[PDB]
Amino acid sequence: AAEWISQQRLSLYRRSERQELSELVKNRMKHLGLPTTGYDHQ
Amino acid sequence: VEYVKGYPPNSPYIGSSPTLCHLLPVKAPFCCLRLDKGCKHNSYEDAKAYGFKNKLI
Ligand SMILES: [Zn+2]
């Protein structure tokens, strides 16, 4: 498994802030129970 | 028990650096984290009862 997360390190390190913020709200909606869909600029 | 290898799911703040960490297979309930008063799962009340193999911090 050490060869599998070696790209998880390379991907989660290069994610843009827009992806980091989008991953935050979706994760919270998952935690509070709201559907993750419907979330998806001025 | 085995500790799974992964990133902590809930980062308390935005910009928190993601780090590969030792993680429990299942998120421990908030009652299991407290020491002075035990819970339904474990009735230990102090580090003596838990019996840690390593020295505390
Ligand atoms: Zn408990």
UniProtKB/Swiss-Prot annotation, chain A:
Question: Which locations, inside or outside the cell, does it occupy?
Answer: Cell membrane
- Where does tissue-level expression of this protein occur? Highest expression in liver, brain and spinal cord. Lowest expression in skeletal muscle.
Q: How is it modified after translation?
A: Phosphorylated by protein kinase C. Phosphorylation of the C-terminal domain increases channel activity.
Q: Which domain of life is it from?
A: Eukaryota
Functional description taken from the UniProt entry = Sodium-activated K(+) channel. Acts as an important mediator of neuronal membrane excitability. Contributes to the delayed outward currents. Regulates neuronal bursting in sensory neurons. Contributes to synaptic development and plasticity.
Assembly: Homotetramer; which constitutes the Na(+)-activated K(+) channel. Interacts with KCNT2; these heterodimer channels differ from the homomers in their unitary conductance, kinetic behavior, subcellular localization, and response to activation of protein kinase C. Interacts (via C-terminus) with FMR1; this interaction alters gating properties of KCNT1. Interacts with CRBN via its cytoplasmic C-terminus.
Question: What does the comment on domains in this protein's record state?
Answer: The cytoplasmic gating ring domain of the closed KCNT1 channel harbors multiple K(+) and Zn(2+) sites, which stabilize the channel in the closed conformation. Under low-Na(+) conditions, the abundant cytoplasmic K(+) ions stabilize the gating ring domain in a closed conformation. KCNT1 contains at least two Na(+)-sensitive sites in the RCKs domain where Na(+) binding induces expansion and rotation of the gating ring that opens the inner gate. The cytoplasmic N-terminal domain facilitates the localization of heteromeric KCNT1/KCNT2 channels to the plasma membrane.
Q: Family membership, please give it.
A: Belongs to the potassium channel family. Calcium-activated (TC 1.A.1.3) subfamily. KCa4.1/KCNT1 sub-subfamily.
Disease entry from the Swiss-Prot or TrEMBL record: Developmental and epileptic encephalopathy 14: A rare epileptic encephalopathy of infancy that combines pharmacoresistant seizures with developmental delay. This severe neurologic disorder is characterized by onset in the first 6 months of life of refractory focal seizures and arrest of psychomotor development. Ictal EEG shows discharges that arise randomly from various areas of both hemispheres and migrate from one brain region to another. Epilepsy, nocturnal frontal lobe, 5: An autosomal dominant focal epilepsy syndrome characterized by childhood onset of clusters of motor seizures during sleep. Some patients may develop behavioral or psychiatric manifestations and/or intellectual disability. The phenotype is more severe than observed in other genetic forms of nocturnal frontal lobe epilepsy.
Its name, as the record gives it, is Potassium channel subfamily T member 1
| Species of origin | Homo sapiens (Human)
Q: Please name the taxonomic classification of the source.
A: Eukaryota, Metazoa, Chordata, Craniata, Vertebrata
